[PDB]
Amino acid sequence: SKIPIIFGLINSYQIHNLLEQHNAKTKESKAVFLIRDSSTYPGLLTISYYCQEQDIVKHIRFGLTDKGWKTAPKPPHEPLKSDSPEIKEKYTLDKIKFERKMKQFINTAKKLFEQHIRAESFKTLIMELKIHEFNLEGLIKPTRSQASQEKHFTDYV
């Protein structure tokens, strides 16, 4: 009857309310966090937490590699109305780089996500959370109806 520790596709309002319910805003950044299915890239996991320094919720994506779960390529900073041509020209190159790297990363991550449903990959997720200094005692656990229904996570308990 065990519930996975991974959330399914939850919305931004729910993510913020879960972090606030667990007092993320009165604790150090990363002291409280949740793990959910990525809503942009199937097969990836997204860690959501509160960043005290900026007073915003932040997200970091992980995907399977041959070594286990690892940090995915990060996208370049969003365009702004105020952007100068110099900003925009650099964004072009950084966006192409991000798209190329994410394409290769997803291709490998999705193949691994699909084959080892019964997974000693779980321990490698814990390792990467530790390297990123997430307080494992601060993991928010989903209720049964909110947990991921992805088969890879059935035993992520």
Residue 157 in tokens: 């308990």
- 38 is an annotated ligand-binding site residue: yes
Give the other-Cβ count within 10 Å of 101's Cβ: 13
Give the other-Cβ count within 10 Å of 152's Cβ: 22
Give the other-Cβ count within 10 Å of 21's Cβ: 10
The amino acid present at 77, given as its one-letter code, is H
Helix (H) / strand (E) element for 131: namely helix 122-131
DSSP sequence for 12-69: HHHHHHHHHHTTGGGS-TTSSEEEEE-SSSTT-EEEEEEETTTTEEEEEEEEEETTEE
- 40 is an annotated ligand-binding site residue: yes
Residue 23 in tokens: 């007092």
Residues 6+ apart with CB under 8 A from 130: 136
- 59 is an annotated ligand-binding site residue: yes
DSSP-derived 3-state class of residue 72: coil
- Spacing of C-alpha 21 from chain mean position: 20
Experimental method: X-ray
Helix (H) / strand (E) element for 125: namely helix 122-131
- 36 is an annotated ligand-binding site residue: yes
CB-based contact 87:78 (threshold 8 Å): no
Q: What share of the chain is helix, strand, coil (3-state, %, to 5)?
A: 40, 20, 40
